[PDB]
Design a binder for this molecule. Structure first.
Ligand SMILES: NC(=O)[C@H]1CCCN(C(=O)[C@@H]2CCc3cccc(O)c32)C1
Ligand SMILES: [Zn+2]
Length: 139
């Protein structure tokens, strides 16, 4: 679990969005596994606007942060799960690192700010949904 709180927005994994997220929906994209909902309180986070390919992410299944080298946002095949049929997920970045079910929502940051959130994993891999192209989060 986890979310990004920026301005009056809450960014979560679409597959983990709550009834309240859907009742305050701003934007969602199943192909990216993202959902943004509106908040009343002002957020605590700021978003990176950069091309970093190294950073640090939070891994809840280890209660620890790990450094990672990750690929540029791209269209990647993701096998069927209880949440989605087998499909291509867009704007996904892969890296070698630990992840398991429960770790979605962990934040990836570089020196400029938040880059994205954990969205996929498997056998020593971790995938992050990029949010750096969502310029409207800042306004
Ligand atoms: N974005 C998606 O389509 C997600 C939806 C939830 C299931 N998916 C996974 O990859 C899980 C969650 C992280 C993780 C780590 C290790 C193994 C795994 O199967 C998983 C795919
Ligand atoms: Zn950066």
């Amino acid at each position: 679990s986890g979310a990004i709180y920026v301005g009056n927005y809450r960014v979560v994994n679409r597959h983990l969005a709550t009834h309240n997220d859907w009742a305050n929906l701003v934007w969602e994209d199943s192909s990216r596994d993202l959902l943004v909902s509106s908040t009343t309180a002002q957020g605590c986070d700021t978003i990176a606007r950069c091309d970093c390919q190294t950073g640090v992410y939070y891994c809840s299944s280890r209660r620890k942060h790990y450094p990672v080298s990750f690929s540029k946002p791209s269209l990647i095949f993701v096998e069927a799960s209880e949440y989605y049929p087998a499909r291509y997920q867009s704007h996904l970045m892969l890296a070698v690192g630990h992840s398991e079910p429960g770790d979605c929502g962990g934040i990836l940051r570089c020196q400029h700010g938040v880059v994205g959130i954990v969205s996929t994993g498997g056998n020593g891999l971790v995938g992050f949904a990029d949010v750096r192209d969502l310029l409207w989060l800042d306004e």
